[PDB]
Amino acid sequence: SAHNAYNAGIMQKTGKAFADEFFAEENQVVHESNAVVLVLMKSDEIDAIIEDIVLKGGKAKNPSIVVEDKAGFWWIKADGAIEIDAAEAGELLGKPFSVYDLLINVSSTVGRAYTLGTKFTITSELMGLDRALTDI
Amino acid sequence: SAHNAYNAGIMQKTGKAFADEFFAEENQVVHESNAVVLVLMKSDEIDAIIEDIVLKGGKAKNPSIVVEDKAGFWWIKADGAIEIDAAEAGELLGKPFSVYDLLINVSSTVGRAYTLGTKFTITSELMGLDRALTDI
Amino acid sequence: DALKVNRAPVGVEPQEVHKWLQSFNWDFKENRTKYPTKYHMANETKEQFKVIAKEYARMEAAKDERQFGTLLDGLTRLGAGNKVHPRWGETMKVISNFLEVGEYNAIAASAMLWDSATAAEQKNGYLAQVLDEIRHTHQCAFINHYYSKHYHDPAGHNDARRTRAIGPLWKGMKRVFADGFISGDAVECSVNLQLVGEACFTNPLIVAVTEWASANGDEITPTVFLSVETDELRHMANGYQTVVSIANDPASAKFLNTDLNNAFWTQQKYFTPVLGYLFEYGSKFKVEPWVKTWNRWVYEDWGGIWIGRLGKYGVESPASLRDAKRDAYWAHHDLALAAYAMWPLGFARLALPDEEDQAWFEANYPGWADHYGKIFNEWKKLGYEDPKSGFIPYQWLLANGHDVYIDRVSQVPFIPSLAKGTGSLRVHEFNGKKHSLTDDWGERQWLIEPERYECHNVFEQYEGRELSEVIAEGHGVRSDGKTLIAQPHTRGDNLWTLEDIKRAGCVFPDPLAKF
Amino acid sequence: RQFGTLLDGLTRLGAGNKVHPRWGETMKVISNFLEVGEYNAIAASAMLWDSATAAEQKNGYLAQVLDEIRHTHQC
Amino acid sequence: AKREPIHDNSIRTEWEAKIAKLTSVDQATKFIQDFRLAYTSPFRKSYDIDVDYQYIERKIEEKLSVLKTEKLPVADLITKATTGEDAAAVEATWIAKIKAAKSKYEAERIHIEFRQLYKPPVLPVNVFLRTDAALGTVLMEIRNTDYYGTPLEGLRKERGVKVLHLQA
Amino acid sequence: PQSSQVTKRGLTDPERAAIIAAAVPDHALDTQRKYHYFIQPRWKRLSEYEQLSCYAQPNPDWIAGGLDWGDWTQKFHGGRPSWGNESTELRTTDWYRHRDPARRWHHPYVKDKSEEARYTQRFLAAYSSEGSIRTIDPYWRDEILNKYFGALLYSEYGLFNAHSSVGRDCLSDTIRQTAVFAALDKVDNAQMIQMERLFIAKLVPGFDASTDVPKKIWTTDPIYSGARATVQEIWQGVQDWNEILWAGHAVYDATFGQFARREFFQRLATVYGDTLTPFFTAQSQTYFQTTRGAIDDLFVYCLANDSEFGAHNRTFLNAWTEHYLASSVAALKDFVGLYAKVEKVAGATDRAGVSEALQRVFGDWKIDYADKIGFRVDVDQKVDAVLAGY
Amino acid sequence: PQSSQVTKRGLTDPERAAIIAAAVPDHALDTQRKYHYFIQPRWKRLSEYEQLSCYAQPNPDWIAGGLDWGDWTQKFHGGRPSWGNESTELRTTDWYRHRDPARRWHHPYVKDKSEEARYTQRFLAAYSSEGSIRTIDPYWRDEILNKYFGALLYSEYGLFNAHSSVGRDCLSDTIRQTAVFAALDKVDNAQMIQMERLFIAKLVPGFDASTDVPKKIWTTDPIYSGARATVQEIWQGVQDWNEILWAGHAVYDATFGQFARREFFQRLATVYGDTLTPFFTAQSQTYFQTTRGAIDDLFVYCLANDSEFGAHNRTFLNAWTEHYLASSVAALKDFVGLYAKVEKVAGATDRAGVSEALQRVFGDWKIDYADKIGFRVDVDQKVDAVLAGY
Ligand SMILES: [Fe+3]
Ligand SMILES: [Fe+3]
Ligand SMILES: [Fe+3]
């Protein structure tokens, strides 16, 4: 879990300690990561999804999820994949809610993200290369 | 003009001075007034109408208009009648604007108010009694 | 023909359709209102707002989208729901849910008026009002729904449609804004609902309140209430069109001023003390003295611009106005005494005026400190706020001879030994039942019309029962089953429970048993 | 939702002039410079729609073409 | 008195046991008319069950209405009172009685008693509502004439109250 | 400046915000955040529709389902209660049971109708640019459409007005919403017919879009004689608010209304080259199916199966149906005389075509309504009774 | 808590709000508050449409109308400029002159289409509840509609794809908006035809809504042979972006497209009892008239009258028209063979009816487009050339 914090690892250092690590030879190439980053824009519907889907059942299925408050948006980072069922969000909210309504306040994805049925998935997997896309 | 201020007349007194006037025998019956009161809810479109219609051409045609800032709304009181042409508001705003769009942010009328064509009028006159209502 | 025609782009605007509306009605001998009435509405009345069904929806949906954007997007992202002073976020439990029943009952009242009118245009103005009051019901609900989700005390925001039934203040609200709208001559109901309730008292209740809300940190209520009133102004026009439509009916010369004066007193009897109480005692930051608000909106502007101008058509200044002015000065302070003394029966948390509130009260109402402030400061010393005190001030009033009575007509409480507003106790026995009446106008209503006014009061229903049992049976508790929704302070600790109330030994009496 | 927040709620609050001057100046540059990126992305996405052969792939680029018009107007 | 709880108490439970023993339309009609003469309106004979009579009344109406649908022919449901009287005839009778009333005190008693005796399910809904509406129109025109004429002292004597206290 | 203080906002003023922040507790005082959490949900979880609507009506415990207590505070002269059991013959264990299956509170209702409002004007401006009016049979246009379709607006307008006392008298909040939305859709239908006529007048010089001729036809032409009589009765002849809803929507409008709108004016527009009228009947028929979902819930699903009063309620529903179905069959028998005024087209306006259309209306009605409340009806018998007037 | 600072908002935090308030001057620093106040307004006052659109394209002064200067920063291998005069034969004194008369920036465009999106689903759910499909001629349904209407989606899909290079290559922001919205409406038409077919499949068991048969017909049936050839040419045969717009919308779609959509599939739906298809053609025809207003402004009002290049531009417009009108007449001559597959109805599908329909399309086109650019056309001659294939 704490590896997925916004301020993880080098980000805790300041001043010269930060500079020494940032310029170290090991950090001059990218390092492959199995993380996904999800950004959700704050709104009435999103704040309920965060509290009652992401931080309860979501974190139960994926204990690596970290959620951080960035004032206007929620920053979420997890190992592997994050999945949100719009059908479940609608039951929680008590109103019609398709996958396209969920996308009204989904603001960024660092990861492979797609829609299938009522479900929105953001995944580390290389969709269409290692695993095909399907129809309903 | 200053007779139409929110805090006109008795409203400037406090404490016992207010009480003495409020309970004076002359003030135990209503006094007929030729004023109208218009309340406009603050919004981008309304604040432009206030600045460029009500307080320029409006006050030129009716110098008795007083406008007061009540935080969430504009309180307007004038002698006789206030008229707002939605056709002129649309030219100012640069977008389609019918009389029904103007009504989105018209929040109260103390007066006889009606719609005819593109024009919204609030008037001291006893419409339908002293002056008939018409069609277009 | 089949090859030529004009091909310029044209549509049909709403006012083009509206012009044909008057001719939709048609003549048959059964075509008359089903409801009892002394008046006859003229067939040719026209309406001030030319609205048809499609344009109605277009106009209202555009208001909604802006309102729900502000709420669900912008104010939620700012966290505005919990940036409200606690006194005000508690007051909004009562304001929005009590106003809700007025919006709800106005649906049925407007429909009864649509039935009464004969002119298609006049029916159409009432019909637009019927739809609006559905909007407003859902809008008041939305306020308490939003507060339930985002404010630090959702209890009572989340269940007032059942927890309002415990307490006495709710009964008076049902008279002005529920039964007063729908039970009577259609025209008496119209003056209660439209000419007085809407054209007079919603200016303070719905418009002026938004400035108090904003002063105390609440930008949710302005967003909605200012939108509510955009529809309300069309209802003010309905009330005026009622008067226009009966103007040439000889019955109006016989009856209209009596119906108007009864309705004016009915509405003012509750709103004058209750709004002044909720504005001044349910806020931290105050905008202006309530008696000045009433003077501006009720006495000078509504009185001068509506009633004063109708003078040339036979409408008189209401005979009860002088009594109403005395209430505007003192009766909300009288009501505060009863509201604070019976705090456990409500569904909101209250705060005694603090040192700076008291200074403001005495400056704007000289004499307040020697009468009301002395009492509040004694109660504070006796432990009003402290759940281990065993102290509930309703008992203290009884111990000192300051009995509370309920007006059989208006359901407003009255404390004759302490009151500075209008009224005096009359106790009658009639056919083996005692009744308490509190002013000249409502005493006459009851004497002439006793089968209209049979409302059970809280002392009749709760006689001999202990406070905490009534509160538990009414579900007046939080989700733990034991901490009261209502509290005598707005702090986050030392909350009262059912067992703290039970320790005070408070049992309801029959106040009229001594007579 | 966006235009409600802007034209109704934030305007009634006076938010437009509650910005630190340094930042309200910076937004002159950020929003108008970003605008040209949104604008030119319309034409770029259309060139990619031309390049692709799969109808679905053309459709993803086409949705982007419309979005970048949205964003031009939003900046 | 010490009241029981509001919605579930020994008074209501006892009256429900009586009502369950009604077995015929004639018996149920007599029962509900007696109940309404005894316990409703400001001219009721007793206030003893004041806080429970309205719920109890609903339960009697329910029993009478079901017995009606089990025992009467369909056409009777539309055109007759359960007394056996012609519904249209009840209408014409009571509109005649109120238009002959000389005072507001006579008019008010006619309207109240009409409701005591014929409130649904005794009379059909449509006939009942229309009659009630015509009676109320008359009652209001009488009462609202010169409404402020009589001073309170006189109204109190006309009404017949025992004045128990008047504050000075 | 201005005469009155400019009030400082508690949200943004630094002094007031600091004071407010010091008064707000650092924890919630309760955890129950579901608004009116005690409502019994009809579906898997509480909907916003139920939350915003259910128990707004302040009924006491002596009106089945109510949560409050005691008498009303103010009643009618004579004693008539604000609301009461004497308003209808039907009975139930809980008046708050009804749910509109489309879950319309006020906002989704005007949102949807606003889309139809604005799209209609875009369609009309394009249709006039297209010149598609050139292709409509001018006899259908000026004879059937202008006069007999025009006259049908009075049937919709009378059904609308039948709801006034329903809106005052009915006994719960979800029922009142259903009824009011139904009423507005019916007056919308009346206004849309007149909008069509006014539109045609802009395109065809000397087309008369005045209501005078339609109103003469509605009031005096025998083709509408039974329709007008049933509508005058449903509106002004009764006051039981369940009778009015059931008679108006579930019998008269489901039989005569569906025949007149769909089987006659919409279906025959698509044989005489009318490309304009089916745009307008698309709306009325959509409004009819949305209203039907709600009327079905109230009467068919709930009141006809109330655990204590179902059979009781079906006695009244069956009596009502027998009476208004006869009125409606009469109305249809007068109406099918219109076919004498139109071109005979095989399978459409010949006796075989009218008989298949009547078989569609009555057979649908039997499945949608009659079978579900126990009402026995012989479809063929009703079709033959209407053909008597052909 | 969380690893990173929780940022205090400058709007509501008392400390930060106080600091900001002390930095904001007490007066405005300029009084010009009209955004891009220097745009020349087409109408009485600047519109929001012009303000948000005009000069977003950063053209330099060597592309007529541009406000910037210097070369592009990065060009194609070989030197092709980011945008350039070499993209089209037409010329003008100012590429930013064009205005869509409907003034669509992005928000009104998706607002309107969203209303049509949601209303369509409500209409389909009611239409299926109505059972109005029962009344459609099953030969028209499974033979003309499924196969030949299905195949028409490829014509709309090809017109859509013709815009890809137009969206990359055109030279101003109002033109680019017009072109992109036109493109989406054409692919919307293609998707709506397939939506209709998929809808019918839910109602009629064994109706095949797969595109296989429509695609076979589009590619191999001689009825579509000339259509497909013109569309392949307009899309992939040219790159002048003014040629593509003019050929696609003002010639091919205004002649073949209007005949196929309105005179054939919409008009004949209203003779074989099809109450479903005119709901969908109502949208395509509305989209056609909105697109026409904009194409007219660009070509007819502006480029054909440019003060310096009007006659120059009409030389190209007339040449283009001569070439694509011949292609379109050929396409129509192949298409009218479809009438051999349908029931002969007098004044509709007989030679007289087809000849009056062709007279409507070509006569309208002459007034809307041909007369306005100086193009001489003999309507009767074009009608006779098409009837050759009847
Ligand atoms: Fe309201
Ligand atoms: Fe209202
Ligand atoms: Fe972008």
Closest-CA distance of chain F to residue B96, Å: 13
| Cβ pair C100, F56 in contact under 8 A | yes
Alpha-carbon span G28 to C93, nearest angstrom:
42
Do E44 and E81 fall into the same domain?
A: no
Is residue B85 classed as helix, strand or coil in its secondary structure?
strand
Q: Which residues contact F181 (CB under 8 A, 6 or more apart)?
A: F104, F109, F291, F294
Type and span of the H or E element at B107: strand B106-110
Alpha-carbon span G328 to G346, nearest angstrom:
26
What residues make up the domain containing F302?
1-390
Q: Which residues contact C342 (CB under 8 A, 6 or more apart)?
A: C167, C168, C394, C404
F355 phi and psi angles, rounded to 5 deg = -75, -35
Q: Which residues contact C413 (CB under 8 A, 6 or more apart)?
A: C168, C335, C338, C404, C405, C406, C407
* Closest C-alpha among E161, B99, G238 to residue C515: E161
Q: Searching chain D, which residue's CA lies closest to the CA of residue F9?
A: D13
On chain D, the residues whose CB falls within 8 A of the CB of F9 are 13
Q: Which residues contact F285 (CB under 8 A, 6 or more apart)?
A: F261, F262, F266, G126, G127, G130, G132
| Cβ pair C363, B14 in contact under 8 A | yes
Q: Which residues contact G217 (CB under 8 A, 6 or more apart)?
A: G147, G148, G150, G151, G223, G224
Type and span of the H or E element at B108: strand B106-110
G371 phi and psi angles, rounded to 5 deg = -60, -30
Q: Searching chain C, which residue's CA lies closest to the CA of residue G358?
A: C3
| Cβ pair C278, C95 in contact under 8 A | yes
Which residues, in sequence order, are bridge partners of residue A73? Answer: A41
Alpha-carbon span F186 to F190, nearest angstrom:
7
Please give the distance, rounded to the nearest whole angstrom, from the Cα atom of residue C199 to the centre of ligand 2.
9
CB contact under 8 A, G9 and C83: no
Type and span of the H or E element at E117: helix E104-118
Tokens of G147: 């196969």
Annotate F17-45 with b (16+ C-beta within 10 A) or e (fewer). bebbeebbeeeebbebbbbbeebeebeee
- Supply angle C-alpha C496, C500, C505, rounded to 5: 135
Q: Which residues of C are annotated as a binding site for Fe cation?
A: 103, 133, 136, 198, 232, 235
A45 phi and psi angles, rounded to 5 deg = -70, -45
DSSP string, F362-388: HHHHHHHTGGGGT----HHHHHHHHHT
* Closest C-alpha among G37, G70, G71, G69 to residue G54: G37
Place of tokens 């009327």: F295
Alpha-carbon span G125 to F289, nearest angstrom:
9
| Helix residue spans in C449-497 (DSSP H) | 458-462, 467-473
CB contact under 8 A, E167 and C447: no
G touches A, CB cut-off 8 Å, minimum 3 pairs: yes
| Radius of gyration (C-alpha) of chain B in whole angstroms | 17
Q: Searching chain F, which residue's CA lies closest to the CA of residue D12?
A: F9
Please give the distance, rounded to the nearest whole angstrom, from the Cα atom of residue G287 to the centre of ligand 3.
26
Whether chain A has a CB inside 8 Å of the CB on F44: the answer is yes
Q: Which residues contact D39 (CB under 8 A, 6 or more apart)?
A: D68, D72, G56, G57, G58, G173
Alpha-carbon span C19 to B120, nearest angstrom:
18
Do E103 and E91 fall into the same domain?
A: yes
On chain G, the residues whose CB falls within 8 A of the CB of B93 are 48
Alpha-carbon span B58 to F352, nearest angstrom:
69
Active site residue C455: no
Whether chain D has a CB inside 8 Å of the CB on G168: the answer is yes
Tokens of A99: 């996958």
Give all chains having 3 or more CB-to-CB distances under 8 Å with chain C: A, B, D, E, F, G
Q: Which ligand is nearest to the CA of C110?
A: 2
Alpha-carbon span E158 to E105, nearest angstrom:
9
Alpha-carbon span G343 to G340, nearest angstrom:
8
* Side chain identity at residue C469, one-letter code: E
Closest-CA distance of chain C to residue F238, Å: 9
CB contact under 8 A, B94 and G51: yes
Is residue C10 classed as helix, strand or coil in its secondary structure?
coil
Instruction: Give the DSSP letter of residue B81.
Output: E
Type and span of the H or E element at B123: strand B119-123
Do E32 and E62 fall into the same domain?
A: yes
HSE-up (13 A, CA, CB side) for residue F181: 30
| Cβ pair G296, G371 in contact under 8 A | no
Does residue E91 lie within any of the structural domains? yes
Query: C249 — alpha (psi -120 to 50), left (phi > 0) or beta?
Result: beta
Query: C46 — alpha (psi -120 to 50), left (phi > 0) or beta?
Result: beta
Alpha-carbon span G80 to E58, nearest angstrom:
89
Q: What technique was this entry resolved by?
A: X-ray
Q: Which residues contact G329 (CB under 8 A, 6 or more apart)?
A: G255, G382, G385, G386
Alpha-carbon span C321 to C264, nearest angstrom:
8
* Side chain identity at residue F388, one-letter code: A
Closest-CA distance of chain A to residue F333, Å: 44
**Number of neighbouring beta carbons within 10 Å of residue G53:** 28
Does residue E97 lie within any of the structural domains? yes
Whether chain E has a CB inside 8 Å of the CB on F44: the answer is no
Which residues, in sequence order, are bridge partners of residue E86? Answer: E80
- Helix, strand, coil share (%) of chain C residues, nearest 5: 65, 5, 35
Alpha-carbon span G304 to G308, nearest angstrom:
10
**Number of neighbouring beta carbons within 10 Å of residue C392:** 25
CB contact under 8 A, D1 and C75: no
Closest-CA distance of chain F to residue G315, Å: 28
Do E98 and E40 fall into the same domain?
A: no
Give all chains having 3 or more CB-to-CB distances under 8 Å with chain B: C, D, F, G
- CA-based end-to-end distance of chain F: 79
Instruction: Give the DSSP letter of residue G104.
Output: -
Whether chain B has a CB inside 8 Å of the CB on C319: the answer is no
Give all chains having 3 or more CB-to-CB distances under 8 Å with chain D: B, C, F, G
| Cβ pair G150, G217 in contact under 8 A | yes
DSSP string, C411-454: --EE-TTT--SS---EEEEETTEEEEE-SHHHHHHHHH-GGG--
Q: Dihedral of the CA atoms C479, C480, C485, C487 (nearest 10)?
A: -150
Annotate F63-89 with b (16+ C-beta within 10 A) or e (fewer). bbbbbbbbbbbbbbbbbbbbbbbbbbb
CB contact under 8 A, A94 and F44: no
What residues make up the domain containing E103?
72-144
Alpha-carbon span F226 to F224, nearest angstrom:
6
Alpha-carbon span F217 to F150, nearest angstrom:
9
DSSP string, F83-122: S-GGG-S---S-TT----TT---HHHHHHHHHHHHHHHHH
- Pairing state of beta strands B66-69 and B35-41? unpaired
Q: Searching chain B, which residue's CA lies closest to the CA of residue D12?
A: B42
Whether chain F has a CB inside 8 Å of the CB on A87: the answer is no
Alpha-carbon span C136 to C157, nearest angstrom:
17
| Cβ pair B97, B115 in contact under 8 A | no
Alpha-carbon span G312 to G305, nearest angstrom:
10
Whether chain C has a CB inside 8 Å of the CB on D1: the answer is yes
Please give the distance, rounded to the nearest whole angstrom, from the Cα atom of residue C102 to the centre of ligand 2.
8
Does residue E112 lie within any of the structural domains? yes
Whether chain D has a CB inside 8 Å of the CB on G20: the answer is yes
Query: C455 — alpha (psi -120 to 50), left (phi > 0) or beta?
Result: beta
* Closest C-alpha among F107, C221, B45 to residue D6: B45
Tokens of B91: 């030219």
What distances in angstroms separate CA E22 from CA E31, E55, E60, F7, one per listed residue?
Answer: 9, 17, 9, 68
| Cβ pair C97, C158 in contact under 8 A | no
Please give the distance, rounded to the nearest whole angstrom, from the Cα atom of residue D55 to the centre of ligand 1.
53
Please give the distance, rounded to the nearest whole angstrom, from the Cα atom of residue C230 to the centre of ligand 2.
10
- CA-based end-to-end distance of chain G: 79
Question: HEC profile for C313-354?
Answer: HCCCCCCCHHHHHHHHHHHHHHHHHHHHHCHHHCCCECCCCC
* Closest C-alpha among C221, C225, C184 to residue C203: C225
The total number of structural domains that make up chain E: 2
Tokens of C71: 């709420």
Instruction: Count the residues in chain C.
Output: 515
Instruction: Give the DSSP letter of residue G377.
Output: -
Question: HEC profile for C185-238?
Answer: CHHHHHHHHHHHHHHHHHHHHHHHHHHHHHHCCCCHHHHHHHHHHHHHHHHHHH
Place of tokens 């073949």: G256
CB contact under 8 A, B43 and D6: no
Whether chain D has a CB inside 8 Å of the CB on C70: the answer is yes
Closest-CA distance of chain F to residue D5, Å: 16
C-alpha torsion sign, points E123, E125, E131, E133:
positive
Q: Dihedral of the CA atoms G347, G350, G351, G355 (nearest 10)?
A: 40
Q: Which residues of C are annotated as a binding site?
A: 103, 133, 136, 198, 232, 235
Annotate C290-321 with b (16+ C-beta within 10 A) or e (fewer). bbbbbbbbbbbbbbbbbbbbbeebebebbbbb
Q: In a mutagenesis test of the D interface, which of G13, G87, G106 is the best target, namely the one with the most D β-carbons within 10 Å?
A: G106
The total number of structural domains that make up chain F: 1
Question: Beta-strand (E) ranges in chain D?
Answer: none
The total number of structural domains that make up chain C: 1
Please give the distance, rounded to the nearest whole angstrom, from the Cα atom of residue G383 to the centre of ligand 1.
63
Is residue A100 classed as helix, strand or coil in its secondary structure?
helix
Alpha-carbon span C138 to C103, nearest angstrom:
9
Alpha-carbon span C466 to C165, nearest angstrom:
17
Do E39 and E22 fall into the same domain?
A: yes
The resolution of the experimental structure, rounded to one decimal in Å, is 2.0
Place of tokens 């700076």: C356
Which residues, in sequence order, are bridge partners of residue G38? Answer: none
* Closest C-alpha among C274, C265, C258 to residue C321: C265
The residues of D that are catalytic are 75
| Cβ pair C507, C464 in contact under 8 A | yes
| Cβ pair G177, D52 in contact under 8 A | no
**Number of neighbouring beta carbons within 10 Å of residue C38:** 24
* Closest C-alpha among A78, A68, A64, A71 to residue A109: A78
Tokens of C248: 């040439």
Is residue F82 classed as helix, strand or coil in its secondary structure?
coil
Q: Dihedral of the CA atoms E143, E144, E150, E153 (nearest 10)?
A: 70
Whether chain G has a CB inside 8 Å of the CB on C9: the answer is yes
| Cβ pair F300, F372 in contact under 8 A | yes
Q: Which ligand is nearest to the CA of D74?
A: 3
Which residues, in sequence order, are bridge partners of residue A40? Answer: A74, A106
* Closest C-alpha among E6, E64, E7, E9 to residue E35: E64
Alpha-carbon span F270 to C20, nearest angstrom:
28
Q: Which residues contact F151 (CB under 8 A, 6 or more apart)?
A: F214, F215, F217, F218, F221, F224
Residue D25, annotated ligand binder? no
Whether chain G has a CB inside 8 Å of the CB on B93: the answer is yes
CB contact under 8 A, E143 and F77: yes
Alpha-carbon span E134 to C35, nearest angstrom:
8
C-alpha torsion sign, points G167, G169, G174, G178:
negative
Tokens of F354: 């009218």
CB contact under 8 A, F127 and G285: yes
| Helix residue spans in C1-156 (DSSP H) | 14-18, 53-68, 76-78, 86-116, 120-150
| Cβ pair F200, F280 in contact under 8 A | no
Place of tokens 């025609």: C5
Alpha-carbon span G110 to D66, nearest angstrom:
10
On chain G, the residues whose CB falls within 8 A of the CB of A69 are 2, 6
Q: In a mutagenesis test of the G interface, which of F118, F122, F267 is the best target, namely the one with the most G β-carbons within 10 Å?
A: F122
Tokens of F352: 């075989």
Alpha-carbon span C124 to C113, nearest angstrom:
10
Alpha-carbon span C329 to B27, nearest angstrom:
14
Q: In a mutagenesis test of the B interface, which of C15, C211, C322 is the best target, namely the one with the most B β-carbons within 10 Å?
A: C15
Whether chain D has a CB inside 8 Å of the CB on C76: the answer is no
**Number of neighbouring beta carbons within 10 Å of residue G232:** 12
Which residues, in sequence order, are bridge partners of residue C426? Answer: C437, E166
Alpha-carbon span G52 to G60, nearest angstrom:
19
CB contact under 8 A, D50 and G11: no
Q: Searching chain A, which residue's CA lies closest to the CA of residue F102?
A: A96
| Cβ pair B73, C194 in contact under 8 A | no
Alpha-carbon span C117 to G271, nearest angstrom:
46
Tokens of D58: 């053309």
